[PDB]
Amino acid sequence: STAEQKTKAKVLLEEGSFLGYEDKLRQRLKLGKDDRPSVSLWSVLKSMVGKDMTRMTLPVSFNEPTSLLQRVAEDLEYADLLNQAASFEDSTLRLLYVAIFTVSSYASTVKRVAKPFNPLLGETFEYSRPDKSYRFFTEQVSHHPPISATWTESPKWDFFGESFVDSKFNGRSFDFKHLGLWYLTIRPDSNGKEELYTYKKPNNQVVGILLGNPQVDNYGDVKIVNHNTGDYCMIHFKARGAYEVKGEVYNAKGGKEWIFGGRWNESVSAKKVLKPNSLEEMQVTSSGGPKYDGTRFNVWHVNERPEFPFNLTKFAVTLNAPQPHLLPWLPPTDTRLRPDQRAMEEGRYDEAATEKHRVEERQRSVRKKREEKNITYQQRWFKKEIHPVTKCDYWKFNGEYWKQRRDHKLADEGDIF
Ligand SMILES: CC(C)CCC[C@@H](C)[C@H]1CC[C@H]2[C@@H]3CC=C4C[C@@H](O)CC[C@]4(C)[C@H]3CC[C@]12C
Structure with a gap:
């Protein structure tokens, strides 16, 4: 472990980053299966040509009980590839593993033709x-x-x-x-x-x-x-x-x-290119790690995928879990507390439709009141800044969430559900 790594590990622990995560990962949903009917996609979509995903109303058969916030978190399913990348002295081999990490998150998208919840502001x-x-x-x-x-x-x-x-x-x-x-x-x-x-x-x-x-x-x-x-x-x-x-x-x-x-729904392999000017590309068996002699080595394989309701992956099942020891630490804004999404996850689709209407109406009314008072909306945990290396605008995390959570200062941090 280098000095900057331990520095980082020190900060994660002092900020209480892992408190509340003592429960074993969720392994399955309450629902065993469900039988939302399989409504034809085209029958729904033929009347909504030219619309955005967030501008369309859809039957529950085309909804999934995850937030866009959690789909983005499925980037992290195969994040062990990043620690593997960290371990290689050769910077292009680090890039190879960073690259395959970016590829590995698309296996989980198969078989989930459904709209995730559009997160509330x-x-x-x-x-x-x-x-x-x-x-x-x-x-x-x-x-x-x-x-x-x-x-x-x-x-x-x-x-x-x-x-x-x-x-x-x-x-x-x-x-x-x-x-x-x-x-x-x-x-x-x-x-x-x-x-x-x-x-x-x-x-x-x-x-x-x-x-x-x-x-x-x-x-x-x-x-x-x-x-x-x-x-x-x-x-x-x-x-x-x-x-x-x-x-x-x-x-x-x-x-x-x-x-x-x-x-990208199965496995990716790699090989060392020996002549730097070659134009060889990968033609579509060492499972021991990277090889410099030009032989092929596996780098990534998809996790096994049991049948779950909504065809969730195993990693995705852990995300919306209202773990007993976690709930006391959460802000009122955490997706695990969102009630229409929770009811959907448990197969109560009319309660989900009822709670969705309520939280969407509230969102709309808070917005109209802001506009009538010339109130500029301010994000709570991020601020748009200009990145020094890329010179692009990015959302800079203000560093406060994990320490305020540690200190139980989150009870008043939002009211949207
Ligand atoms: C009306 C219904 C049928 C539309 C369904 C569209 C589905 C397939 C779309 C809409 C939202 C999309 C997701 C939006 C964001 C991400 C994060 C990215 O890092 C990986 C892909 C992933 C996870 C997308 C997968 C496909 C997705 C779930």
Whole structure:
């Protein structure tokens, strides 16, 4: 452990980042299954051509009892890849593992063709994992348009960014573009000061709507750049004509150092590129770690996925869990306390519809009162600032949430549910 890692581990512990997380992870929902009818997507969407996801009303069969705040937290499912990245002295090998981390979060999107809850303005979600030594926090900082800010902290890595999803049903497919920038900081075990990576997420689309078999497809080009070295990585999620992803990792001089590829719903493998000028890309068996001699090595495989209601992954089941020892620590804004989403999770769809209307009406009335008094809305835990390395606006976490939580100062921090 380097000095800056222990420094970071010290701050996480003093701030009480893991208090309240003593209960064993949630393993299953109360519901065993559910039989929301399978309503045809097209039958619903044919009347709503040109609308945004947040501008459409839908049957419960097309709703999922997670918040957008928690879907973003599913970035962290395979975050062990980031500690693995931290351990490598070769900076392009760090990039290779950082790159595959960005790819690994799309396996969980398969089979969930459903709308997550649109977080209320000021809604928040915390999630700490003592067994991994990371803490995650997010706040819904904007409602028109919907935007979430995240901030994840661990001894060997940080990860934060803006979730600004812009969506459009064009009458054939449902397209989702991710407009915010993502920041991934590594504190290497050796040979390297703290280093920053930035990238933007690929696009998603729902297709097969016309055919009667709607499918989540992720697609597009991704560029990760190490602002300190500065290696870079090209990733290509192939559009459905889906599942294939390939990537190439370069040093700062343009030398192709590594390539990787696989199916982002299954597994990704990689190999060392020996001639830096090669244009070889990954053609779509060592499970012992990275190889420098040019043989292929596995890097990521998808977790096993038991059947759950709403086709949740195992990681996703742990997110909305109203753990008994956690609830006393939470602010009133935490997604675990949101009542329409809770009732939905437990299969009570009319109570969910009733509570959704109530909290949405309140949100609207608070907004109208602000406008009538010329009151500018202020986020509670984040402030928009200009990032020094990228010179982009980002949501800077104000550092107060985990210490105020530690000190039980959150009871009055919001009233939206
Ligand atoms: C009306 C219904 C059928 C529309 C359903 C659209 C679904 C597939 C869309 C809408 C919101 C989308 C999510 C929005 C944000 C993220 C975070 C990103 O880091 C990974 C993809 C992920 C998790 C998206 C997956 C696909 C998603 C869940």
